Each structure stands twice: as C-alpha cells, then as structure tokens.
Design a binder for this molecule. Structure first.
Ligand SMILES: NC(=O)C1=CN([C@@H]2O[C@H](COP(=O)(O)OP(=O)(O)OC[C@H]3O[C@@H](n4cnc5c(N)ncnc54)[C@H](OP(=O)(O)O)[C@@H]3O)[C@@H](O)[C@H]2O)C=CC1
Ligand SMILES: NC(=O)C1=CN([C@@H]2O[C@H](COP(=O)(O)OP(=O)(O)OC[C@H]3O[C@@H](n4cnc5c(N)ncnc54)[C@H](OP(=O)(O)O)[C@@H]3O)[C@@H](O)[C@H]2O)C=CC1
Ligand SMILES: Nc1nc(N)c(-c2cccc(Cl)c2)c(CCCOc2ccccc2)n1
Ligand SMILES: Nc1nc(N)c(-c2cccc(Cl)c2)c(CCCOc2ccccc2)n1
Lengths: 520, 532
C-alpha cells in the first residue's frame, strides 16, 4: 500500500458548524471564505508545527530501505502537501513552511508563478513520483477540503491527526465524512483550553528486558474483555474521562463481589481534573446539571427541607425523605422530607442542636463555609482549610450519613485546588454527578476568593459498581469521550451566598446519548 | 570482557548469620552441606523462572557476538540456559530434581568424570573448561548456581556479569557464606517488591558489573510538556541509576522526589519554607510486610504508647511525658496554649484531641482529669462492632475532626479519619491526612496506622490486607532537603514484620509488651535537620 511505503498522513483541525444528536461528524468545519473559521488557536498551531516538523533520523534507515525495496533499488525533513487555495490563504511571512519540504497541488499555477522554495505538482500520481526521488521522513497532507477528499478517497492516508475544536463557527468548507469501516480512532489526547475554547487531538488509523520478566515471575468476575473491544483497541487513552472509565474497568476486572443487591468493590482511588483546562462533565453518556446546581445552592443556604428541592422538580433527595425511609431510619418523630442535620446544616451550623427543617439557626453552631472562605482569603497557606459534613454526633439524626465526607483546599500562586474524600462511591450513577458538583463548588469558592480554579481531586474510599449497572457500563466503556465543555460563572457574584441558577452556564457540551444504568 | 561475551551470571539466596547493616548482612549460603532454612517456596519459584527463561528471538545477537569473539562463523565451526554447580552443590540436590529440567547441567569436579555421570550432563575440572564448552554450545545464558567455593572463584576470576541475589530477611546457623560484593566492582540496578514466604520476608535484587508507528504518536501527545526547582541531577545519581524500583519504600521516596522536583515554594507559619503539592496515595500490603522505612532508622516505642493513649481516650499530655514520649510536648506548653488563645488551659491539657474524639465525640470537654465514662459517642467501639456485625458497611469511619471542638484542641488533628473495608476475612484501612511533613512526620504516620490496622484486624478475627495513606497538603521542609537527598540515594532493605501477642482480643487490652518488630534491617539514622 502506497500510504505505508511513503508514510502519507493527513493533519487537520475541525470545529463544530452552524436535544442535539452528536457523532464524530459533529467536528467537520475546516474553513470560511478562503481562511480559517476561527482566529488563532495557538495550542493547535503549536501541535501542528510539532507533528509536521518532527523527524527521527534513527528510524530513517528502515524507511529508505523500505522505499528502495518497493521501487527496486543536511537535516532530514518531512514533506508537507497543500492545495493551491490553502497555500494562497497562508500569510507570506509563514511561507514556505519552515524546516519542511513544501509541495503545492495546482493546475492553474506552474513553477514560474512562485517566488518561493516550493515544488509544484499537477496531479496526485506526480506526488508519488516526487516522494520516490526525495530523502524525507513522513509526508503530511495539510488540506484543504478538495485535497483531503481526493487523498481519503484513494486510501492514500495511513493516519489522520485530527484536532477537535470544541466551539461553533460559520464554515463554507468541511472535512469529508470519515468512513468508520476504513478509519478507526486509535488514540485520544488530554483536553486543553486555548483562546477561550476547549480542544483535543485524536488519531484515526486506516483499519534490562529479561529483568522485567523475572521481576514479573509472580503475577475472575465473569467479565469477558471481548465485551470491551473498542476500549481495549485504543493505544493512548489520555483524555481525563479515562480516569473514570479506567476505574470502572478495574472494578469490573479486579473487583470484590459483596452484598448490600450485588456490587463489585475496591478501596482507594484518586482522580484529578484540571479545571483551568476543562469542565469534567462526562461525555460518554448525557448528564444534566440543573438538579445538582440547585442541590449545591440549597446546601449553601444551610437548608434541610426536602420540599424546597421537590418544588423545583429536583428529586435527588425524594426517596430519603419518605415516611417509610425515615421510619426505617428510626426517625418516627421526623416530618416527611425533613432530612435532619445533613450537608447544609453541617456547613453553616456544625454543632448546633437540630430541631426541625423550619427553625431559624442564625448564629447557632459553626459556620465552617464562612470560616474556610476567610482562611482562603486571609491565610491561604493554612493546612486547616477543611469543610467537614461527617458530624459523628448527628449521624443517626440524618436521613443518611454523608457520602462526601470533607473538602480540603490548597492555594498556590493565586490558584485554588480542592480534594473531596468520598466514603462510598456508586461509580455507575453517583460518581459522574459528584465530579460535576465539587468541580462547580471549586469554581464558586475560587471566584468569591478572587482566585483561579486549578485542580479538583476526587478521593474514592469504598468504590463500587452495582451488578445491575454492568451491561450499561460495558456499553459506555466502548464509547470514545468528546472534548469536555466549559463552565461560565457570572463574574458579578462576589459572595458564596449570592449565586442563583442563572449565574451558571455549561457551554459546548458534546456527548453520547443518555444511558439507563438499570435496564428495568 | 569474557563474562559479557558468554552472559555468565550468578544466582544465589542469602540469609542473615547467627548493630550496623550493609549489603554483607545478607551472606548466609549453607549449613552442614544443605540450605540454612527449611524451604522458601517463593525463592524456589523465582530461581526456576530465572534459570529456565530464554528468548529465542534474542539469540542471533548472542551467537553472532560469541562466534566473532572466537574467530568463527558458526558455533560448531531447543534453546536452553546452562547451569553450573559445585560437586557438593550437585551432591546436595535430591535425585528426582536432578538433572535440573530444561537446563544444560554442568558440574565442576576435580575428582569425578563423565563415566561417573550420564546423559548430556557435562563434567568439567577447570573453570577454563566451562568457557571452551560455552564456545561449543548453543545456549541463552549461563547461570552459576554456586556452592560458596564456586561463587568465590568465579567472582575472583571476574567471570560474573550480573548477580541475581535473593535477600532472605531472617537469621539461620550457617557454615558457608557468599563473598563480600565490593561496591566499586558491582552496583545494584534493580530491586523487587517485598514478599512473605514461609514465615520470612524476602526480596530480589540485581547487581551489575560497573511497530514503532505508535512511537512517534507518543512524541506528538507530549508536544506541550515543559522541571521547576533547583535540585540537581548528579545529586540523585544512585536513585536515578536504578532501572526497576519495585520495593514499596519507593512509594514514599518517589513522593519526596516529586515534591523536590515539581513542588511549590511556600512560606508556612515558622517562615521555615516548604515545597508542597496536594493529593497523593500510598498503599502498603500488610499481608506481605510491615512498612517501617529502611532508608533511615525509625523507633516505635513512642508511637505505640501514643496509640495506647488514644485508645484509653486520654488527653493528659503528662501521661506521655512521664514515659519520656515527647511527641506532644511542644503542643502543651504555656506559650503554645496561650498562642492558641487557650489561656484557661492547664499545661499539657491538650483538650479534646484524638483520644477524646475516638471515645467521647460530642461530650462537653471540661479538663484532662474529668470522668467521661459513658459520655459522647464511643466511635472506636462502634467501628469494631460494625466490622464484626456488618462488615460490608460503607459507614465504618473513625473521625477525629470535630468541627465544634477544633478551637479547644491544642491543635486540630493531622489524621482526619480512618475508613475500613472488609473482604474475604481481610481488613484494609484508609487514613486521610490533611497535612504531611514528608521528611520527619510521614515515616512515623505510616507506622502508627499500619500498627493500628493490625490491632483492629486482630480484635475482629480478621487478617490485615492494605494500609492506604491519602496525603492532602504534602510538604518537604526546606531544612530537610540535604538529608532527604542522602536518603533517596540509599537502597531499601527487605521490610521487617510486626508480631502482636495473639491472645489480645479486645482493643483496650494491648500493652507495650504486646508488640514486637522482627528482622528490622535499616540504614543509619539521619537527623532530618543538618544532615546525618
Ligand atoms: N482547518 C484545517 O485543518 C484546514 C483548513 N483549510 C481551509 O480550507 C479552505 C481551502 O480548501 P478548499 O477550497 O478545498 O481548497 P484546497 O486547499 O483543497 O485547494 C484546491 C486546489 O488545489 C489544487 N488541486 C487539488 N487537487 C489537485 C490535483 N489532484 N491535481 C492538481 N491540483 C489539485 C487545485 O488548484 P487550481 O485551482 O490552482 O488548480 C484546486 O482548486 C480554506 O478556507 C482554508 O483556510 C485548509 C487546510 C486545512
Ligand atoms: N544459598 C544458595 O544460593 C546456595 C547454597 N548452596 C549451599 O552451599 C554448600 C555447598 O557449597 P560449598 O561446600 O562450597 O561447595 P561447592 O558446591 O562450591 O562445591 C565444591 C566442589 O566443587 C568442585 N570445584 C570447585 N571449583 C572447582 C574447580 N575450579 N575445578 C574443579 N572442581 C571444582 C570441587 O569438587 P571435587 O572435590 O569433586 O573436586 C569442590 O570441592 C551447601 O551447604 C549448599 O546447600 C549451594 C548453592 C547455592
Ligand atoms: N491541526 C491542524 N491541521 C492543519 N492542517 C492546519 C492548517 C490550517 C490551514 C493551513 C494549513 Cl498549512 C494548516 C491547522 C491550523 C494550524 C496551523 O496553521 C498554520 C501554521 C503555520 C503555517 C501555516 C498554517 N491545524
Ligand atoms: N535464588 C537462589 N539461588 C540459588 N542458587 C539457589 C540454590 C540453592 C541450592 C542449590 C541450588 Cl541448584 C540452587 C536457590 C534455592 C532455590 C532453588 O534450589 C534448588 C533448585 C533445584 C534443585 C534443588 C534446589 N535460590
């Protein structure tokens, strides 16, 4: 195959184009009015230069050998191929592309029409003849859409280096629909922010050593890894959603079978999400945030009245407030939906005597939420900046003891990080919401303290997958994450108590379709 | 030059012999013509896998090298390894195991000959006869299986390229010994995980004579990578020299390295200066070892008395000071309490700290002398009852962070909570630590909660599994950096074991004499401030 002999690759960047359904074809915008749809995305410029300039002299020998064999026979550079329209779009000061052998496809222009150190070729076949005559490492097709269409059509592309630009622009030219039977995603990068958009980089592919063994001399759950074909097919799984999906995989393959309803469990994990780069709302199924933002606002108001959330059509706590649920807790003297001294009460009134959900607890008990905001502002190197919901004295009065034990804060160089320790983690249903809740809370605390958010760090104690979620989670693990969305806060909010639901916007959420974790 | 062309390695297992420690601590080979120990099945398994493994696809380069060396184009002019045994060694092996399967057996003997023996098992009577025999064989590697006498001469004659050395961390009567490996002539390049087999810990160390399509994609995904701090390269030469660092002590040492290399410069209360990072997890397998650091010397009497004091529910610092346990002495002074605004607190009245929260959470603290019997929540009793009666509970947590009482404490607890997990008769524990002094505090903290896990496991009739240490604010004091650079260049020894008196079946019944550390092999003490 000519793409394998001559190492022909495509590299492109695609944005989104003007109950949405998402698929890989979501990312297809290439151009508008003969230029790019976006103003500079500097990180993609940096990636593009690194990929198209990188050469490995030690691997050249084998490539020269392979091409000589196939053909019957100063510094090494890559070849870059551009359509004439692409070429004319590039600013003069960037042309010819530095440290690369520049090739232009044109019928209307000939070598006499160019001042620059470029090769002009007038048909695809003449590129292959040219590649036979040059010393080069790899050949990158740089676009635009006519050039990509014809090279993909002729199966002349070994891999596509595809930048997913997670923002929407006016486009008039599009990357061709990639045929799923001809090209497979094999690698996915980390998620980044550049020039007020998130993006990632994916790769489509055409469809002492003895001592390691010795140390390995001493190396289950009716899970069939051929149930995880796509998941196990990927080479590089660098997208941060894989911190979650890898824990699911680990519990399924290595988990302990336990009772209450079956689970598989393991003990002790950590996930870290870079909130400066993305908002980690899972993309491998559809999540909604209205409920968990109302929950957080209800916590911050210090409320324990389940009816407040129910009147907003938020049902997160409904089951924990029923007559039957409260009586099974021995809370015979608790009104329905009076959840007792749970999160909000502990955050604003730790150590106060709970009475009922209607009482006015003003200036009763410890306002640890106000205290941690004061420590972050006035004593940011403190190792005591903890917010703790696990009030040992009050546990049996709560509808149930908190899962989210504590949040600890860390301030360095004007940036806020947060650790949340979770004693009990429902990986299939609860953890995706819990990541989103404490990520939003970190943003709120950072803003009211005039800081930038850095990391949300999630520590999982008892980490379990319900046996009833296994089939749904096998479906999810075989989906490839999309670049994450971004969270916007109203910058006018200066105090933790002053946020309302319209002060939060999730932008550029691209996701696979919703999953029922339990299939009735 | 020879040992490199013919790939001649030594494989041995050494015990300790019947207090300063060094590599030569591990030198026991034999007693009265047999092995000093009863039988260590994991070393048997390692020995068999190492001495039998061969890689067909890597032979061409070995044969090529050997032919070139011997001025030949072919060996003669199923790939196996050669194993070389002393006659005493050979005559100590039982019949059913001789000759050693899937290996070319060679025996050094001056007094026996090929007539006395059989098959394709070679006798040789000089060491030079091995080199000519290797010149004439197709084999992968050559392993010297010893005898003291055999290792002695092969090491003198400089004929060993690597030593595969098993460290058996227990003491036996020995009459023969492995030669002192000179530090200038051999260096450790790799160290394994620590195991238990047949009532001893052991590890495996290695001494050395002193589709690449997806390979570029790795370079592309790395295009945005930067190494902050003015710690030097040469300064961690031994640490950076090792290839495989599988010993569990590296979970601690790798965090020190990470903080030194990538940590954030901050200035804490005493303007000492730290390097800090946020969020780590260490996991220690208490079924296989007791994780007492071996790269410096650590003492445990104080740390045990501290836990016994917590378990009694005590808050009286004088109790510990009267036993010369001075861990809380700084936090109980008039000056320290006054600076905490505890003007009405007696000296060494630490307030409602760990022991009070563990036995009496929510009770009104009065003074360190009051009778709190039956006041507040006995969380320690409650978690023991949950482990025994509801072991799949996800609510088995023991929490010292009482938000209501923090300001009454001499200081708020560093060790926020313990969570327990029970599976298949085994107990694991997570401890979450808000503030971690990596150089001085964390080594003790790992020991304290590993001991506590053993005590809870034992009173609940469970076996300990993991101790899992979660670090929040993890910092290295700038005044510890020189000492931690010395420590990171020390290779760990196999870990000791903890033995509890097995008769103790109630958490309140332990006494200092119920705790024994066995087989603690450690580098020299380090004063973390002004290098020792
Ligand atoms: N986002 C991204 O990754 C990229 C975006 N772009 C954008 O794409 C748009 C330009 O793309 P589009 O208009 O398709 O134009 P192209 O850059 O694909 O250029 C088309 C021209 O190349 C020549 N050509 C193509 N194939 C051949 C052939 N086989 N033999 C001879 N000549 C050939 C012809 O030139 P002639 O007419 O002179 O014969 C043809 O008109 C722009 O908006 C640009 O900004 C460009 C590349 C990448
Ligand atoms: N812990 C471990 O890893 C190991 C321990 N052992 C233990 O060590 C002890 C046995 O070793 P040790 O007593 O030294 O005996 P060795 O096995 O070293 O055997 C010594 C005999 O080998 C022959 N020999 C040695 N060198 C030569 C030579 N250069 N040329 C010809 N023959 C040579 C001689 O036998 P002859 O008299 O026939 O000439 C010599 O007397 C036992 O207690 C055994 O269990 C053994 C192996 C490994
Ligand atoms: N991933 C990726 N792939 C691409 N093929 C391009 C692209 C877009 C238009 C023209 C050209 Cl030559 C390249 C970019 C856009 C970033 C690089 O844009 C250029 C940088 C330097 C010189 C020319 C274009 N990103
Ligand atoms: N790491 C290590 N190295 C070794 N050189 C030996 C050793 C000890 C005595 C005799 C022999 Cl042949 C080997 C062992 C002991 C485990 C294997 O011991 C035997 C193997 C086969 C037959 C008899 C003993 N472990």
């Amino acid at each position: 195959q000519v793409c394998d002999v001559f190492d022909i690759y495509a590299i492109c960047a695609c944005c989104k184009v003007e109950n949405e359904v998402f698929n890989n074809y979501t990312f297809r915008g290439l151009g508008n009015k003969g230029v790019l749809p976006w103003k500079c995305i500097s990180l993609d410029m940096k990636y593009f230069r690194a990929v198209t300039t990188y050469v490995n002299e030690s691997k050249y020998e084998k490539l020269k050998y392979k091409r000589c064999k196939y053909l019957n026979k100063k510094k090494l550079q890559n070849v870059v191929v551009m359509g004439r329209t692409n070429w004319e779009s590039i600013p003069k000061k960037f042309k010819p592309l530095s440290n690369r052998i520049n090739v232009i496809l044109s019928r209307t222009l000939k070598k006499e029409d160019f001042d620059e150190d470029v090769y002009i070729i007038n048909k695809v076949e003449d590129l292959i003849v040219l590649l036979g005559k040059l010393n080069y490492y790899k050949c990158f097709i740089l676009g635009g859409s006519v050039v990509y269409q014809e090279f993909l059509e002729k199966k002349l592309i070994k891999k596509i280096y595809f930048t997913r630009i997670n923002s929407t622009y006016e486009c008039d030219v599009f990357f061709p629909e990639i045929n799923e039977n001809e090209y497979q995603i094999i690698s996915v990068s980390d998620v980044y922010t550049s020039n007020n958009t998130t993006l990632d980089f994916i790769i489509y592919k055409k469809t002492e050593e003895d001592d390691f063994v010795y140390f390995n001399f001493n190396k289950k759950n009716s899970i069939h890894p051929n149930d995880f074909q796509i998941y196990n097919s990927l080479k590089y799984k660098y997208h941060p959603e894989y911190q979650y999906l890898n824990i699911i995989y680990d519990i399924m393959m290595n988990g302990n079978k336990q009772s209450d309803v079956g689970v598989l469990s393991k003990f002790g994990y950590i996930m870290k999400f870079d909130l400066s780069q993305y908002f980690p709302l899972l993309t491998t199924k559809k999540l909604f945030l209205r409920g968990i933002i109302e929950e957080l606002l209800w916590f911050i108001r210090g409320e324990t009245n389940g009816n407040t959330l129910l009147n907003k059509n938020v049902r997160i706590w409904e089951a924990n407030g029923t007559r039957e649920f409260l009586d099974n807790r021995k809370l015979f003297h608790r009104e329905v939906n009076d959840l007792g001294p749970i999160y909000g009460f502990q955050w604003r009134h730790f150590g106060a005597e709970y009475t009922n959900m209607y009482d006015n607890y003003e200036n009763k008990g410890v306002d640890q939420l106000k205290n941690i905001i004061n420590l972050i502002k006035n004593d940011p190197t403190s190792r005591r900046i903890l917010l703790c919901a696990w009030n040992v004295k009050d546990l049996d009065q709560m509808a149930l003891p908190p899962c989210h034990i504590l949040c600890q804060f860390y301030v360095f160089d004007g940036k806020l990080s947060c650790i949340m320790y979770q004693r009990s983690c429902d990986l299939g249903l609860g953890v995706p919401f819990n990541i989103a809740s404490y990520s939003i809370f970190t943003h709120m605390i950072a803003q009211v303290c005039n800081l930038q958010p850095a990391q949300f760090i999630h520590v999982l104690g008892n980490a379990h997958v319900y046996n009833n979620h296994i089939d749904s989670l096998k479906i999810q693990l075989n989906r490839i994450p999309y670049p994450f969305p971004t969270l916007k806060l109203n910058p006018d909010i200066k105090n933790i108590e002053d946020f309302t639901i319209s002060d939060f916007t999730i932008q550029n959420y691209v996701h696979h379709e919703k999953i029922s974790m339990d299939m009735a």
